Amino acid sequence: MLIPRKVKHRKQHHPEQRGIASGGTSVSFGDYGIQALEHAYITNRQIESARIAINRHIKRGGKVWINIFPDRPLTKKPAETRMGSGKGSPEWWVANVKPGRVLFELSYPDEKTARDALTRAIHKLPIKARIVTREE
């Protein structure tokens, strides 16, 4: 799981989830990547599942870059409780994703296996994404 070692403030507001990804929209580390198309909260659960999916599919040798970090905490007040008594305790972690941001990036020799591992990862995410290549 990806968890920040510390955050200055542990109870923030929900990340504003509007607009198009301005920063981080290109594939730079590896040759193939997964590039997003919808706003969402990608938790570290989703990221871990997707990374393990890619590693299971390729399983030999190739680099997976998770160039998004879940470092924004969503809190949840304990069950069966009414409204009030202050904000809850943080208990899951999130990356704020805009349409445009390359989420995962992969470097691997062949084409079809790389594409299939990337779509295997895509299926684990709460959004629509597409496979994007290192060239325009």
Partner 1 sequence: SSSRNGRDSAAQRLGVKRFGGQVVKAGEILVRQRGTHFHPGVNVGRGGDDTLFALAPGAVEFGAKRGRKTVNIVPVARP
Partner RNA sequence: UUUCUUGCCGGAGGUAGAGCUACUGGAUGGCCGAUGGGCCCCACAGGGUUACUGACGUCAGCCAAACUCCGAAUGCCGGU
Partner RNA sequence: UUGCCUCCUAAAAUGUAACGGAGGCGCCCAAAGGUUCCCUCAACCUGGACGGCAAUCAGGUGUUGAGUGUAAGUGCACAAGGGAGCUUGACUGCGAGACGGACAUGUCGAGCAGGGACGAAAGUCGGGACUAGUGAUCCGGCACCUCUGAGUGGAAGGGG
- Work out which of 55, 69, 124, 132 binds RNA, going by CB under 7 A: 69
Distance CA 63, CA 47 (A): 15
Cβ-contact 50, 124 below 8 angstroms: yes
| 61 contacts RNA (rule: CB under 7 A) | no
Instruction: Please list, in sequence order, all residues whose beta carbon lies within 8 angstroms of the beta carbon of residue 110, skipping any fewer than 6 positions away.
Output: none
Tokens of 30: 């590896």
Nearer to RNA, 50 or 66 (CB): 66
Distance CA 104, CA 66 (A): 5
| 18 contacts Mg ion (rule: CB under 5 A) | no
Binding site for RNA (CB under 7 A): 2, 4-13, 15-16, 18-19, 21-26, 28-29, 63, 65-67, 69, 71-72, 84-87, 96
Binding site for partner 1 (CB under 8 A): 85-87
